């Protein structure tokens, strides 16, 4: 703790020795005065805080403040703090949904360096080629591990750093894309202690929006090998909203992927969790507002077979959303064209639930479904309901 004499502010300093004063301050704040101690360095903290507070002012003000010779010092300045040893988790069985978030000790001073980083990457000049030699593949590699943090406030600031690097640095796009694929591939089948994937998935949303058309083989393998199996995640309840968007947006680029996506969706269907299925049905419902009629002609049997299974559910919410399927406009338009094949599958199950369930509200919607199919080629309904009753007469024979 060497005494920190307050050097003259850069406002008082003239044109000369400005970088020398600037560089000296960066070496002055490169120290690691820890904040774990309750009461220590009662004078050293604020002057460091004041310098950083003035430093953020210095970068925002003026234009020619940043020079090439300073590039090394800033990277050393930033890397000395952000590239820290992350504290161990307070509880290995910590619940992100239930337990309160864990805070950070050095946050009052960390709030300034991340701000310093943000206003630096967004600087008016920021020649990337000069920074290309200094911000190399090694800087990014340690940056990704910082997403494993536990403080929610840090993740939002961290994410904006990654997007700024990717949008400006044209050299490491391949690395960060490959790194993004690599880091996700761990999360699908591993210990999976990662907690910043919700913030991580936000970056994936803005990287697929730029995927040029037509697709390439590398981008094709992203869906069936990474994104689709991600629905088997234990904690999908927090990542589904961002995970649902990228599937739809990616599908909107090449419509030929609709068949593999739907079949892939039906493979990892939830089995024992009621809440998992409710959001899962919302995924399939969204897909049907962008589906093409020709692509419908290939998924009538497998997709609708599952829907006819989920209506006969033991939970109201699972049946509630499924019954709301016969309320859309595009969905009803599609099922009118191929009524001949859809009707024989549901109608056996839609009629059974009509007079067995207890809640009138679920039964009330069922009447609307059955009456809706009477607004179609009802001769087939008449052919069905004449034959179907004979199959129920066949079931009456089973009773007999």
């Amino acid at each position: 703790q060497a005494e920190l004499h307050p050097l003259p502010q850069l406002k008082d300093a003239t044109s000369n020795e400005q970088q020398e004063l600037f560089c000296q301050k960066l070496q002055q704040c490169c120290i690691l005065f820890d904040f774990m101690d309750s009461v220590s360095d009662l004078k050293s903290k604020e002057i460091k805080r004041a310098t950083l507070n003035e430093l953020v002012e210095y970068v925002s003000t003026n234009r020619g403040v940043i020079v090439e010779s300073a590039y090394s010092d800033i990277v050393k300045m930033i890397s000395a703090n952000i590239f820290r040893t992350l504290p161990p988790s307070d509880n290995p069985d910590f619940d992100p949904e239930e337990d309160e978030p864990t805070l950070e000790a050095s946050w009052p001073h960390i709030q300034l360096v991340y701000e310093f980083f943000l206003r630096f990457l967004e600087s008016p000049d920021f020649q990337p080629s000069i920074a290309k030699r200094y911000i190399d593949q090694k800087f990014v590699q340690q940056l990704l591990e910082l997403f494993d943090s536990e403080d929610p406030r840090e993740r939002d600031f961290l994410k904006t750093v990654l997007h700024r690097i990717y949008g400006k640095f044209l050299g490491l796009r391949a690395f960060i894309r490959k790194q993004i694929n690599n880091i996700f591939l761990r999360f699908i089948y591993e210990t999976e202690h990662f907690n910043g994937v919700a913030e991580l998935l936000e970056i994936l949303g803005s990287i697929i929006n730029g995927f040029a058309l037509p697709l390439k083989a590398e981008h094709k393998q992203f869906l069936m090998k990474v994104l689709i199996p991600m629905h088997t995640a234990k904690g999908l309840a927090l990542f589904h909203a961002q995970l649902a968007y990228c599937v739809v947006q990616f599908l909107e680029k090449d419509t030929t992927l609709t068949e593999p996506v739907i079949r892939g969706l039906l493979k990892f269907w939830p089995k024992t969790c009621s809440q998992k299925e409710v959001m899962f049905l919302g995924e399939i419902e969204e897909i049907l507002d962008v589906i093409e009629p020709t692509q419908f002609k290939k998924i009538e049997e497998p997709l609708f077979k599952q829907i006819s299974k989920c209506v006969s559910s033991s939970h109201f919410q699972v049946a509630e959303r499924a019954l709301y399927f016969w309320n859309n406009e595009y969905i009803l338009s599609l099922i009118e064209e191929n009524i001949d094949k859809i009707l024989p599958i549901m109608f056996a199950s839609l009629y059974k639930i009509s007079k067995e369930h207890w809640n009138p509200t679920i039964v009330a919607l069922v009447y609307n479904v059955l009456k809706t199919l009477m607004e179609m080629n009802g001769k087939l309904f008449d052919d069905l309901t004449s034959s179907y009753k004979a199959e129920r007469q066949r079931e009456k024979k089973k009773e007999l």
């Binding site: 925002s60 003000t61 003026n62 234009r63 008016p124 936000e202 949303g205 803005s206 929006n209 730029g210 909203a241 961002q242 968007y245 739809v248 947006q249 507002d289 962008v290 509630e320 959303r321 709301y324 309320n327 859309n328 406009e329 595009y330």
Partner: protein, 176 residues
């Protein structure tokens, strides 16, 4: 004796604009996370069985609801005007329909970034301008000469996907 009714103003639109709106609202609610206090309501929560979706926007202690509607006039025919939109502002059971050109203006007060108090002063001596406007659909009026001059010297950026606009939603173009 005739029955009682409610009368609304509904702007008739085509489904491509509706699905584009849904995509944009979702992207800026979730992915980029600029509009995080907005609410998106699914069709299965309103008594009227024609509402397709509702968007509620807190404005201080008030709110603004934009409702979309599915097939009206539909049934065989075609889908040039299958959907419809309505906009309402309610406070303590009080409500009034609002023109879109005013709806977009009201949204922009409690939301995205615009020039700060010192932006004009700092432009004079070149001490960098920040934050800068990213929503040009919120300045459809004339406004002071200062804003028009300032917008000239720093042409605002473009959000990667378009920022969500109540005006792009309600535009005919078919009839011109």
């Amino acid at each position: 004796m005739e029955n009682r009714w409610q009368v609304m103003i509904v702007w008739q639109v085509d489904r491509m604009r509706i699905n584009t709106w849904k995509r944009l609202v979702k992207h800026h609610m979730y992915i980029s996370r600029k509009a995080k206090d907005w609410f998106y309501r699914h069709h299965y929560e309103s008594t009227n069985p024609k509402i397709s979706s509702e968007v509620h926007i807190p404005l201080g202690d008030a709110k603004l609801v934009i409702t979309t509607y599915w097939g009206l006039h539909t049934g065989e025919r075609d889908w040039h005007l299958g959907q419809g939109v309505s906009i309402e502002w309610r406070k303590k059971r009080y409500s009034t329909q609002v023109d879109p050109d005013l709806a977009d203006q009201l949204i922009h007060l409690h939301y995205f970034d615009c020039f700060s108090e010192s932006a004009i002063r700092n432009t004079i001596l070149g001490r960098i301008v920040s934050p800068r406007c990213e929503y040009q659909a919120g300045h459809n009026k004339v406004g002071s000469l200062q804003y028009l001059a300032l917008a000239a010297l720093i042409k605002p950026k473009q959000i990667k996907p378009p920022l969500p606009s109540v005006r792009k939603l309600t535009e005919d173009r078919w009839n011109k």
